Amino acid sequence: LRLHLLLNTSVTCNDGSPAGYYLKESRGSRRWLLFLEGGWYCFNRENCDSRYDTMRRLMSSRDWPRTRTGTGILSSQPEENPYWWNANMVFIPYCSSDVWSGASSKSEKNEYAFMGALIIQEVVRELLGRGLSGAKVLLLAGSSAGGTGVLLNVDRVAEQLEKLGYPAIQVRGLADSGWFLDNKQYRHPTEAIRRGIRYWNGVVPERCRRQFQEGEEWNCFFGYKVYPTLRSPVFVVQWLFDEAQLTVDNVHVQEGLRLYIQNLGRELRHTLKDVPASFAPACLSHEIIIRSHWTDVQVKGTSLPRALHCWDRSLHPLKGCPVHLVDSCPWPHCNPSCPT
Ligand SMILES: *[C@@H]1O[C@H](CO)[C@@H](O)[C@H](O)[C@H]1NC(C)=O
Ligand SMILES: O=C(NO)OCc1ccccc1
Ligand SMILES: O=C(NO)OCc1ccccc1
């Protein structure tokens, strides 16, 4: 995939350098995959300054390479990507440190720009001149902070395309490893997101904003609270024992911790009971869709590329082609196909 820096240079990474996207076109295809990278976030001046010292590619385009290799769902090889190998592929780097929510420029009062929500909008607008105008399906995908970003942005992309005069493009979401619980820690998270939203001028989807109201928009960063408010179809991929969830919960085995871990898996499974398109294996891991070996994991005998194909068919239950796949066994690696 080849790098393109945004033509509108007022849409910027944290340090004011232009944001951008990596593209590989497939001219025999009307499917478009736009993938949002992850990588945590920063929520005040001092924490963002630290990230600028040792995580600068997540804050700036000045050092980005001219190309990236497409892997997993972004691969063009059928053996690596049984699902969408012939699609047009787009990788959008995460350089806004705001869970893709921000709408604030650098200024005499702001050391950093937080423009994640505007970066997505501007990528979409510039791609319409490069072939996206002819699309039949636009899949907005993402991992980790990018998976939460899908939940925060998929309906805004759908509204953008309607208002621009493209009502026939079907917008859908794929959220990988971005479905978190605001639960009690094992030893003594929502404070940082509440502060972050104020620091970023962060924006959340309109229906969810109207439910929770002023001061409470942080709620919309949690999948089980924002998902019911969304109109676009969204497929949710989430490990039952996500490593980022456990890190924030201060988990690094006696009875108290055994019960804590079993209760976490049960709660996650409960939040997915009424999510009809979902894939949730009983593994300790983090991210999957752009890993080269994403084809290996299975739930109830069905792989993730197969489940996504069954989802495509359902949007035209299906015999032998399931779309809701959630493990019921209660401990990490009770599924034999978990990543080693
Ligand atoms: C460039 O982006 C900024 C910020 O979103 C916007 O206000 C401005 O209208 C854009 N310019 C053009 C020509 O689209
Ligand atoms: O990036 C991560 N972890 O992978 O956190 C993003 C985030 C923070 C708070 C609430 C939802 C999502
Ligand atoms: O609120 C909590 N639990 O204490 O975590 C929420 C969370 C978990 C994982 C990643 C981001 C945000």
From Swiss-Prot:
Q: What is its main location?
A: secreted
The Swiss-Prot or TrEMBL record annotates one GO molecular function as:
phospholipase C activity
What GO terms fall under cellular component here?
Answer: endoplasmic reticulum lumen; extracellular region
Q: Which UniProt keywords apply?
A: Glycoprotein, Hydrolase, Phosphoprotein, Secreted, Serine esterase, Signal, Wnt signaling pathway
* Catalyzed reactions per annotation: [Wnt protein]-O-(9Z)-hexadecenoyl-L-serine + H2O = [Wnt protein]-L-serine + (9Z)-hexadecenoate + H(+)
Entry's Gene Ontology BP terms: bone development; negative regulation of canonical Wnt signaling pathway; negative regulation of Wnt signaling pathway; protein depalmitoleylation; regulation of bone mineralization; Wnt signaling pathway
Enumerate the glycosylated residues.
N8
Tell me what happens on changing S144A: Abolishes enzyme activity. Unable to mediate serine depalmitoleoylation of WNT proteins
Triggers of expression: Up-regulated in hepatocellular carcinoma (HCC) with high intracellular beta-catenin.
What highest taxon heads this organism's lineage? Eukaryota
What residues make up the catalytic site? Answer: S144 (charge relay system), D242 (charge relay system), H286 (charge relay system)
Give the UniProt subcellular location, in the record's own words.
Secreted
| Enzyme nomenclature, EC number | 3.1.1.98
The record's account of tissue expression is: Rarely expressed in adult normal tissues.
Q: What does this protein do?
A: Carboxylesterase that acts as a key negative regulator of the Wnt signaling pathway by specifically mediating depalmitoleoylation of WNT proteins. Serine palmitoleoylation of WNT proteins is required for efficient binding to frizzled receptors.
Task: Please report which protein family the annotation says this sequence is part of.
Answer: Belongs to the pectinacetylesterase family. Notum subfamily.
Which named protein is this? Palmitoleoyl-protein carboxylesterase NOTUM
> In the UniProt record, what gene is named as encoding this protein?
NOTUM
Q: Which residues of the full protein are shown?
A: 89 to 451 of 496
